[PDB]
Each structure stands twice: as structure tokens, then as C-alpha cells.
Amino acid sequence: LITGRLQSLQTYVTQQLIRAAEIRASANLAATKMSECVLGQSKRVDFC
Amino acid sequence: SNNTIAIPTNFLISITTEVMPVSMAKTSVDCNMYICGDSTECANLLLQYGSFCAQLNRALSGIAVEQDRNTREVFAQVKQMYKTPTLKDFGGFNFS
Amino acid sequence: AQKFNGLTVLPPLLTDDMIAAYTAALVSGTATAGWTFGAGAALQIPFAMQMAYRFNGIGVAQNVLYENQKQIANQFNKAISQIQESLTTTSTALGK
Amino acid sequence: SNNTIAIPTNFLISITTEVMPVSMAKTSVDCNMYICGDSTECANLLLQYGSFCAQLNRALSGIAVEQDRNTREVFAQVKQMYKTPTLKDFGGFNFSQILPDPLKPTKRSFIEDLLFNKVTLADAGFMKQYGECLGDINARDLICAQKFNGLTVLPPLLTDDMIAAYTAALVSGTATAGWTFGAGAALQIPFAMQMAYRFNGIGVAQNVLYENQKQIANQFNKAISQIQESLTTTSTALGKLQDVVNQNAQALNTLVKQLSSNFGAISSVLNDILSRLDKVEAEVQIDRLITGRLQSLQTYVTQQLIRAAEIRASANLAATKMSECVLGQSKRVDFCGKGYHLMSFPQAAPHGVVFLHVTYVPSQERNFTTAPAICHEGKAYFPREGVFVFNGTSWFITQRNFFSPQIITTDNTFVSGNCDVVIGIINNTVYD
Amino acid sequence: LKPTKFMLKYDENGTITDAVDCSQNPLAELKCSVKSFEIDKGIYQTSN
Amino acid sequence: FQPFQQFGRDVSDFTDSVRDPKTSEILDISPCSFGGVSVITPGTNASSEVAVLYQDVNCTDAWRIYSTGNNVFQTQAGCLIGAEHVDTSYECDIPIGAGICASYHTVQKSIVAYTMSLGADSSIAY
Ligand SMILES: *[C@@H]1O[C@H](CO[C@@H]2O[C@@H](C)[C@@H](O)[C@@H](O)[C@@H]2O)[C@@H](O[C@@H]2O[C@H](CO)[C@@H](O[C@@H]3O[C@H](CO[C@H]4O[C@H](CO)[C@@H](O)[C@H](O)[C@@H]4O)[C@@H](O)[C@H](O)[C@@H]3O)[C@H](O)[C@H]2NC(C)=O)[C@H](O)[C@H]1NC(C)=O
Ligand SMILES: *[C@@H]1O[C@H](CO[C@@H]2O[C@@H](C)[C@@H](O)[C@@H](O)[C@@H]2O)[C@@H](O[C@@H]2O[C@H](CO)[C@@H](O[C@@H]3O[C@H](CO)[C@@H](O)[C@H](O)[C@@H]3O)[C@H](O)[C@H]2NC(C)=O)[C@H](O)[C@H]1NC(C)=O
Ligand SMILES: *[C@@H]1O[C@H](CO[C@@H]2O[C@@H](C)[C@@H](O)[C@@H](O)[C@@H]2O)[C@@H](O[C@@H]2O[C@H](CO)[C@@H](O[C@@H]3O[C@H](CO)[C@@H](O)[C@H](O)[C@@H]3O)[C@H](O)[C@H]2NC(C)=O)[C@H](O)[C@H]1NC(C)=O
Ligand SMILES: *[C@@H]1O[C@H](CO[C@@H]2O[C@@H](C)[C@@H](O)[C@@H](O)[C@@H]2O)[C@@H](O[C@@H]2O[C@H](CO)[C@@H](O)[C@H](O)[C@H]2NC(C)=O)[C@H](O)[C@H]1NC(C)=O
Ligand SMILES: *[C@@H]1O[C@H](CO[C@@H]2O[C@@H](C)[C@@H](O)[C@@H](O)[C@@H]2O)[C@@H](O[C@@H]2O[C@H](CO)[C@@H](O)[C@H](O)[C@H]2NC(C)=O)[C@H](O)[C@H]1NC(C)=O
Ligand SMILES: *[C@@H]1O[C@H](CO)[C@@H](O[C@@H]2O[C@H](CO)[C@@H](O)[C@H](O)[C@H]2NC(C)=O)[C@H](O)[C@H]1NC(C)=O
Ligand SMILES: *[C@@H]1O[C@H](CO)[C@@H](O)[C@H](O)[C@H]1NC(C)=O
Ligand SMILES: *[C@@H]1O[C@H](CO)[C@@H](O)[C@H](O)[C@H]1NC(C)=O
């Protein structure tokens, strides 16, 4: 039982790490958009 | 056509929306509580087994700190807290 | 059940009120000073003059903005109202 | 207020730093050595078990190649190795601290030397001899244990001297050739003329640069000195690089420590089991140990893959910044420093890169009364580029970023319509 | 005596010179969980 | 050791020390295998000869090597056996490490090792 439950916890943590990486990419994009579209005017096509 | 061109004669103002995720939930796990519950024998057996869950907690705490970092980096760009103006018209542009 | 099995969810450092305060400050700063090229130090400017400056930025003459100010403001307000009405109706706008 | 505007009347030059990770350590694992040590019976049992060492090593070798790819993509953009100039003044702009010094033996610059002293790493050399580990023993060196359990750290393809050479070439090229839209054929140009060109890029007249050359050079030198002094003082400026180093070291040491887990067997010592029990009874315990140790190795490899993905994203951002801030002038807000971007310099750091962004910041703003348009002879006049300002006695045209009043002339305004449409129009004359 | 968990420190000569009783208080519990006699400034999660 | 101690273990629970039952002298026990090894090949299609790199061996001027051959020499990446050294620089073909690369060049052909070239040399007088 101990072996099985440890495996369950490990799977949960690995999937959490992957999802966190995705969310971090999204947050970086959002910060860039805040800096370049709200605090300035952007000439990049279809960025804002 | 090599002798004609189309030129706009009017314009319009459009407003569009863009939704972006920033952060997710922060979680923590109690090792012994999940594996063994309130059993003392199971706790001793787990201690003998050599659980690897300080590692799991390190990973989860890293994620938890990263979430606050994300929110701060998105929303805390301006270093001055400008007060809300009493009037919200600004020459016909309604900001209410 | 989650808590009884040793699984905890932690609260974010910044509350919803603090994030709302940050967004309100950003909107007020845009409406009052409208930074250009970063945050820096706020430089006040009438809103119509800022709109003319941005029109120049996209390569249009300021007289276009000044002569049609009422129509442009009405279009802006109409777009805001349309956004509000679309949000009010049930949909999957915030699916992510 | 709807009739006033604040205009800056002065400026200053600011240099700011940005630290970015590029690469992490390259590692390899000998699964048989880690699982079974020198035991032949355990080796045969592992062969019977069906281990998956090849898969893990494929993943690790992929990561190892990606690290060198990251470093090359960041630092090897310029295809010409420009030599370091003998003179390091260039019209009052002192470049001595960010270029290698011929007199000193070191091949790096002063600031690079300061950066490399701020990050502490235990593994230096990538060579540990058998005689050394045997002779020490009493020390209980962590690297000796890692190597005795079959965990190896491989050296990067490019040495520190080569990366320093790349950074020196980039700085020399920026100082002597400038570069406008990439790295093609170097077109020499005096540094002051380059600074005037970059001032024009942000919307300022060249006379501003030429007339205040001494003051601007002094501000540049002072900013460089401030950066140097800040780096000299102990701090956590390079926390990210130290974090990368610490994470790699902790992963390897945890892998070594996990060899003491029982994993449901009677003992974690292979020799004890093989000395107490016969083949049939020892097989069960050894199989349990094999399963546990394989699981440990798999966890290590998965975490390494995730960290490598993060580092790759960071290195891609660093390469983009090198291309768009060092080899050109960027109009993106806050992409290269805070303010109006003028130029950037790269410096090599342990496992990373430090960018020095030089930018232009307005200051000392004063208020004025302004109007949208000017009604002259029953005709509306609007500025083509600028703003109408009233300094107290008369009306002028001024630029937003810098205050420089000009006489309202027909050469810097245009007419459209009558005075009955514009809101807030004011009456005044227009000269020739 | 009572059944408890301890963390003992062996010096260079092999003699036990210090110990941590994991049940004394939350700080000791944290020390045992991280397996160190020193803790850096900050906030840490402990057992429920 | 204390009189009541017979064996010693390290942090990984490996028996690393022992008292001799007859003389009572303490002895340290170390594993026999140690050291990283790499194999460089031009491809079995081209040739069956290879070069071997020992990361933790200093061959400058009892060596823990499988078989010494001709052209054994030391590089910043370790001891290399089976490759000839050339003072010329080329673009990297096979990355050995620490600024050293290898290739398959005509002397018949052989494996050669060299320092990699960073880029074209130029001088732009200011
Ligand atoms: C591999 O090991 C060699 C050592 O070479 C010898 O053989 C090995 C097997 C051992 O028996 C060693 O004890 C022997 O020395 C290392 O090279 C030596 O490195 C040391 C430390 O850097 C050098 O010591 C310094 O070298 C300088 C001497 O300069 C004068 O002498 C040298 C040698 O004759 C000559 O090349 C030079 O032109 C000068 O005439 C100097 O900085 C200082 O005084 C000091 O002596 C030593 O000289 C090196 N010896 C040789 C023969 O190169 C390698 O570093 C090691 N490799 C690795 C990867 O660690
Ligand atoms: C800026 O806009 C606000 C808000 O107006 C509301 O939102 C807009 C985006 C549009 O969709 C409007 O149609 C919408 O009402 C204006 O204040 C608001 O004005 C409306 C009327 O336009 C008021 O509604 C009235 O309220 C009472 C109760 O019903 C009655 O007088 C009327 O029956 C009608 O419903 C509303 O109360 C008022 N305030 C708010 C908070 O909504 C505001 O005037 C405008 N500013 C300018 C300068 O025009
Ligand atoms: C470009 O800058 C270098 C370096 O100057 C040093 O770094 C700067 C960023 C500032 O912080 C300077 O204050 C700082 O010294 C100049 O060369 C260096 O000049 C200094 C003096 O300004 C020399 O220090 C002197 O050295 C001896 C021993 O103490 C004595 O003469 C003095 O007591 C003083 O300490 C220094 O040796 C010298 N060289 C170096 C490598 O630092 C350089 O002159 C300047 N270029 C121009 C054109 O002005
Ligand atoms: C580890 O022990 C040594 C030696 O201690 C003495 O000799 C041993 C064989 C044993 O009989 C001990 O009980 C003895 O005290 C310590 O180094 C010696 O310390 C003594 C006492 O201070 C001093 O007089 C000697 O000069 C030291 N000899 C040296 C340094 O070579 C050592 O301090 C002990 N280590 C620790 C961490 O306490
Ligand atoms: C255990 O016995 C050894 C050796 O046993 C004797 O010598 C053998 C060669 C063999 O002939 C046996 O039958 C003998 O009984 C002892 O080692 C000797 O120790 C003495 C101490 O003075 C020393 O002078 C000798 O050189 C040692 N002999 C060797 C071969 O090294 C050892 O001391 C005995 N151990 C105990 C704990 O009594
Ligand atoms: C507004 O600017 C004008 C133009 O520079 C200033 O008038 C000048 O004043 C100086 C002395 O301060 C005289 O030498 C110049 O001849 C004036 N120029 C003219 C009259 O065209 C005026 O002082 C400024 N007003 C304020 C309030 O500073
Ligand atoms: C500014 O606002 C006031 C508010 O009373 C108004 O009277 C005035 O005409 C406005 N000025 C301009 C230039 O629009
Ligand atoms: C092997 O090398 C030979 C000699 O150059 C060539 O003809 C052949 O196409 C190569 N590839 C093979 C045999 O798959």
C-alpha cells in the first residue's frame, strides 16, 4: 500500500509541475502585453 | 489590376477583449497523513521504508512561490498609486 | 475529505481588493497622464490631446480627431456598452 | 486639468543591469553502477529484470546537447571576431571597465571578473582522479561519492575564455562599427555621431547631443562607476545563477542519499543480503531494491527534463534580447531597460549573461498652458508634430519629450476648416 | 523514557555531540523534516 | 573505532570501514570501478576504428585505460587515445568538449582532434 500511494503522490506532483510551467509562460506573455499595450503604443501587427 | 487602387474613406473605433490566465492554486501535501492516516504502526513502517516526500514538498513550495511571482510581475508594474478622479468624463469619453 | 486526507490549499499573497486597486491605479494613470515609453513620471495631459497624439502615432492628422471628437467619443461609448452587454449574457467567454 | 501640460526640461543617462540564465550542468548516469555497484549477481538479476537505462540516457543526452545549443545561440551571433581597440576613450566615453585589459593577465574585463567572483561553485575542473579520491577519503567529498555511485558531470563545449572572447568582440563591434539592423558588414563611424544617430532614433535633435557632449559622457562614466561599485559590494544580484547551481547540486546529492532506502526489503545493503541468504531468498530482496532504485532514477530524469525546458525558454529570451537590444535600437516599451533605449552591452557570467542597458530618462518637468488649435485670420491651425505651449508671454510650438519653444511658423503647422468646429481653439497670429 | 524520534549528530571523530528531539516543538519538527540544525529566515509548512 | 564497534557505514549505508579481526587495525573499503569513458566514431559505415576519451585520467608525460595505442595525449577534456593532434583550427565537426572537436581527415584517413574556430578574424580600424 505504501508503494502504491507514494506513486500516486509522485504522479500528482509531476503533473502539477508541468501545468505550472504552462501557466508561467502565459503569465510572462500577459506581463509583456501589459507593458507594451497599456503603458505604450505598439506597432507590432495584431499584438494588441 | 495594375492601374487602380482602393482607398478607405471612413473609419470606426472598435474595442476587443483578450483573456489570459496568470496564476493557479497553491497546494501542500501532508506525507504521513495521506499515506498512513492516524496509524502509528504504518507511520513506523513508512519511516523504515524511506519516503521521498521532502522532495515532493520542495517541488510544491517552488510552484507556490512562482504563483505569487506571476501575479506580482503582471499587476505591480506601476510604482505610484494614482487616485481615482472624481470626474469620469474627460471630454465625452465615459470611463465610469 | 481533502483536508482529512492531508491535502491543503494555501491563499494567495495578494487579495482581490489589492489587485482591483492596482487595476484602478493603472486605468486612472492612463486617463490622467497616459504614459508613453514606460511608467517614469506621470505627465498630465488633456485626454483629447492624448487621443490626437495616438492618432498621429498611427499616421493620421490631428484635425481628424479634433473635428470629429463627438462622433469618436460616441463610438467609444457604444463599444464599451456593447462589451458590457456581451459580458452580461451567459456564455463561455472566460472558459480558460 | 483640460488646459495644462507638463513638459520635461532636462534629461539624464541611466545604465541598468539584467541577469539571465542560459545553460545548466550536463549529466550522465551509469545505471548498473548506481543500482548494483560491483556485484555480479545483482548485475545478472538486473539484466533479467529488464532495466530501461537506455531511455534515461537518451533523455539526458538530449538535455546535454540542448545546453550547448543554448550557449551557441546566445553568444555566437556575430560571425566576425573584431579585435579590441588599443584606445578606449571614443570621445570621452570610457570603455575600459567593460573590455579586456591587455596589461592584466586575465582575459576577461573588470566587470566580468567581479561577476564571476559573486557566484560560488564547488565543481571546478571536471576531472577527479582515482588516486585523489582514495588519498582523501577522510574528507568525505561529495563529488567522490557521486562518481563512486556512477553519476558524472560533463564539461561544456565552449570554455569561459571563448565566451569572454565573444563578448569582447561584440562590445568592440558596437564601439567601433555600431550596427543598425543586424550583423552584416561593419560600417565604421565615430562614436559621437553614433550617439547622435541614436538620439535621433528616440526623437531628439542631434544638436542636443553635440552641445552637451561632455556632460553626457560624464553621466555615462558615472553610471558605469556606480554599476561597478554596486557589484563590488556583497549582495544577491546574481541569485538566479546561484539558484540554478544549487538546484543541480541538490538533485545529485539527493540521488546519492536515496541509496539508503529499504524499499520494503530487509536491508538496503546488498552485501549483507548476499552474505546472509542463498540465491532464491536473496532474489526477492534484490528485486525490491532494483525496483526502488529504478524509480529514483526515473524521478531524477523527469525533473531534469522539466528544468531543461525552463532554461531553454530563458535562453531563447536572452538570444532575442541580444539580437534586438545589442545589435539594434528597440522601440518596444521596457524590453531593454526602463526609459528610452539607447544601447546595450553584454557581459558573460557563470552559466548566464548580464545585459547593461543604457537609456535616456527625462527629468525636471515644468507645467505650461496649452491649446488644441490656433485661430488665425478665421482659419484653424494645427501642429504637424508637437504641441502649442504658452510660456507666459507668447505662444510657441514645443516637442513633448523635450522643451524647446519655436516661433509658430507656416513651415511647422497646417490649416483645415474654420474656427467654429474645434473645441477650445484660441486666437493668435502666425508668422511667415 | 518514551518512544520518540531523534536526530543525532556525529562529529569527525565519530562521537555524538548534539541531538534534536523532533517532538519538542514546531521548530524541532521543522529541523527534523529538513534534516538540518540551521534554518534560514522565512515561513515553512509543517505537518497538520 | 570503539571496542564495541566492528563495522562502519557512510551516508548511503554502504559499508566503508572495518576492523581487522586478527590485528585490530581499521581499514577503509573503496569500490573498484571509477571514471567516465566516451567513444568517438566516424560511423561503422566509414570505418571500425574509434577513439576513446577518459575523462578522469591524466596521461601527461598504472594508467586506468583499457588499451594504450598510438597517438595518446592529454586534452582539457581528458586523456584521448586513437586520434592525431593537429595545430590547425576548423569548424567543429564532432564536439568533444572544453573547446576540443574531432573529425575524420585524410592523413587513408584517420581521426584527428583540434581546437575549434570561433569565427573569421577581422580588424576594423577606428
Ligand atoms: C596533469 O599533470 C600535469 C603534471 O605533469 C607531471 O606529470 C604528472 C603525471 C605528475 O607527476 C605531475 O606532478 C607532474 O608535474 C599537470 O601539469 C602541471 O601543472 C602544474 C600546475 O599548473 C604546473 O606547475 C606550474 O607550472 C609552471 C612551470 O613553468 C615552467 O615549467 C613548465 C613545465 O616544465 C613549462 O611548461 C613552462 O614553460 C616553464 O618552464 C608554473 O606555473 C609554476 O612554476 C608551476 O611549476 C606544471 O608545470 C605542469 N607540468 C607540466 C609538465 O605541464 C597538468 O595540469 C595535469 N592536468 C590536469 C588536467 O590537471
Ligand atoms: C457614463 O455612463 C454611465 C452609465 O451608463 C450606463 O452604462 C453605459 C455604458 C450605457 O450602457 C448607459 O446606457 C447605461 O445607463 C451614466 O450614468 C448612468 O446613466 C443611466 C442613463 O443613461 C442611468 O440609468 C437611469 O437610472 C434611473 C433608474 O432606472 C433612471 O433615471 C433611468 O430609468 C435610467 O435607468 C444610470 O443610473 C446612471 N448611472 C449608472 C451608475 O449607471 C453616465 O451618465 C455617463 N456619463 C456621461 C457623462 O454621460
Ligand atoms: C577610464 O577609467 C579607468 C579606470 O578608472 C577606474 O574606474 C572608473 C570606472 C572610475 O571609478 C575611476 O575612478 C577608477 O579609477 C581610468 O584608469 C584608472 O584611473 C584611476 C584614477 O582615476 C587609476 O587609479 C590610480 O592608480 C594609482 C594607484 O592608486 C594612483 O595613480 C592613484 O591613487 C589611483 O588609485 C587607475 O590605475 C587607472 N587604471 C585602471 C585600470 O583603473 C582611465 O584613466 C579612464 N580613462 C579616461 C580617458 O579618463
Ligand atoms: C578528535 O580527537 C582529537 C584527538 O583527541 C585526543 O586523542 C584521541 C585519540 C582520544 O584519546 C581523545 O579523547 C583525545 O582527546 C582531537 O584533537 C586533539 O585534541 C586534544 C584535546 O583538545 C589536544 O590536546 C590535541 O592536541 C589534539 N590533537 C590534534 C589536533 O591533532 C580533536 O579535537 C577531536 N575533534 C573534535 C572535533 O573534537
Ligand atoms: C591472532 O594470531 C595472529 C597470528 O597467529 C600466529 O601466527 C601465525 C603466523 C600462525 O603461526 C598462528 O598459528 C599463530 O598463532 C597474531 O598475529 C601475531 O601477533 C604478534 C603479536 O606480538 C606478532 O608478533 C606477530 O608477528 C603476528 N603474526 C602475524 C603472522 O602477523 C595475532 O596477534 C592474533 N590475534 C589476537 C587477537 O590474539
Ligand atoms: C517666453 O519666451 C520668450 C522668448 O524667449 C521670452 O522673451 C525673451 O526674454 C529674454 C529675457 O528673458 C529676452 O532677452 C528676449 O529678447 C525675449 N524674447 C522675445 C521678446 O522674443 C520670455 O521672457 C518668456 N517668458 C517667460 C515668462 O519666461
Ligand atoms: C475645461 O473644462 C471646463 C469645465 O468648466 C470648461 O468650462 C472649459 O471650457 C474646458 N476647456 C476646454 C479648453 O475644453
Ligand atoms: C557509407 O559510406 C559509403 C562511402 O562513402 C557510401 O557509399 C554510402 O552511401 C554510405 N552510407 C551507407 C552505406 O549507408
Author numbering:
A (entry chain C): 965 to 1012
B (entry chain C): 677 to 772
C (entry chain C): 821 to 916
D (entry chain B): 677 to 1108
E (entry chain B): 244 to 291
F (entry chain A): 532 to 592, 605 to 650, 658 to 676
Quote the passages of the study that discuss this structure, keeping the authors' original sentences.
SARSr-CoV spike proteins cover the coronavirus membrane and are exposed to the solvent environment in preparation for contacting a potential host cell, undergoing a suite of conformational changes to bind the viral receptor known as angiotensin converting enzyme 2 (ACE2, in the case of SARS-related coronaviruses) and mediate membrane fusion. Each spike is composed of three identical monomers containing key domains involved in restructuring from the pre- to post-fusion state as well as in receptor binding.
Coronavirus SZ3, which originated in bats and transmitted into civets sometime in the 1990s, is thought to be the result of a recombination event of bat CoV strains Rp3 and Rf1, with the recombination breakpoint at the nsp16/spike. Alignment analysis revealed other CoVs of bat origin were more divergent from SARS-CoV-2, but SZ3 is genetically close to SARS-CoV (GD03T0013) and the first epidemic SARS coronavirus GZ02. Previous studies have also demonstrated that the presence of a fatty acid in the FABP is responsible for regulation of the “up” or “down” conformation paradigm of the RBD, whereby presence of the acid ensures the RBD remains in the ‘down’ conformation and loss of the acid appears to permit adoption of the ‘up’ conformation. These structures reveal the presence of linoleic acid in the FABP of all three SARSr-CoV glycoproteins. Remarkably, the maps reveal a conserved network of water molecule coordination of the fatty acid inside the FABP.
